[PDB]
């Protein structure tokens, strides 16, 4: 491998695995709080082994734990940092699409928790940052904002029933927000709290094969 200059000087630390089949979506992976850019690598394998993988480590630290944007407390985001980091990530997919010579307009995100949130934030703020997105246990990134039209864009949302972190009503609030902007939104339910489960990944694979 020799994309060494970028890997060291880009706006964001990440790993890239060029895929067996370039025509398939580049899978953008976004860890949850306190994880890292390797956590979700198993997910991509289960979802589309042939697909290119771009996996990113967030630029913010909360008590030693990688996060994609600052929060004061669970569910209370720094809204100025959120937009700045959403922009930052969008401007980074720009440079990574050039540097690794893949199609800027064909990227699909698999995020978990905090990682899912910035992914949903991209959907909200930047019309064409993502072709689609798998959101494992997301929240509403921000309220009261005009979304652009998400016409040909498909979103998978996996949420939990007995979840001490995200209320199921807020998970549906997210669905509705997204549909009102003409996204096609599939929604799967698990009843095992906030943990990311095999159950959901298998349903995401299924969904993914049908949407792309
Ligand atoms: Ca500490
Ligand atoms: Cl978060
Ligand atoms: Zn959850």
From TrEMBL:
Domain Phospholipase/carboxylesterase/thioesterase: from-to ranges: 16-207
GO molecular function terms attached to this record: carboxylesterase activity; carboxylic ester hydrolase activity; metal ion binding
Protein name: Carboxylesterase
Organism superkingdom: Bacteria
Residues that hold Ca(2+) according to the record: 63
Coiled coil: none
Entry keyword annotation includes Repeat: no
Keywords: Calcium, Hydrolase, Metal-binding, Zinc
Binding site for Zn(2+): 137, 163, 166, 194
EC number, as in UniProt: 3.1.1.1
Family membership: Belongs to the AB hydrolase superfamily. AB hydrolase 2 family.
Keyword set includes Endoplasmic reticulum: no
């Amino acid at each position: 491998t020799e994309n060494l200059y970028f890997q060291s000087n880009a706006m964001m630390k990440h790993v890239f695995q060029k895929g067996k089949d370039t025509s398939k979506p580049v899978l953008l992976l976004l860890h949850g709080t306190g994880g890292n850019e390797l956590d979700l690598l198993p997910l991509a394998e289960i979802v589309d082994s042939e697909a290119s993988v771009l996996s990113v480590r967030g630029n913010v630290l909360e008590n030693g734990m990688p996060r994609f944007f600052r929060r004061l407390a669970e569910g209370i985001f720094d809204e100025e940092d959120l937009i700045f980091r959403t922009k930052e990530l969008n401007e980074f997919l720009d440079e990574a699409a050039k540097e690794y010579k893949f199609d800027r307009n064909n990227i699909v995100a698999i995020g978990y928790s905090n990682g899912a949130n910035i992914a949903a934030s991209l959907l909200f703020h930047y019309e064409n940052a993502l072709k689609g997105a798998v959101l494992h246990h997301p929240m509403v990134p921000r309220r009261g904002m005009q979304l652009a039209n998400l016409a040909g864009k498909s979103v998978f949302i996996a949420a939990g029933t007995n979840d001490p972190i995200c209320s199921s009503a807020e998970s549906e609030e997210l669905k509705v927000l997204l549909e009102n902007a003409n996204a096609n939104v599939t929604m799967h339910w698990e009843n095992r709290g906030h943990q990311l489960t095999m159950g959901e990944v298998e349903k995401a694979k299924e969904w993914y094969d049908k949407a792309f």
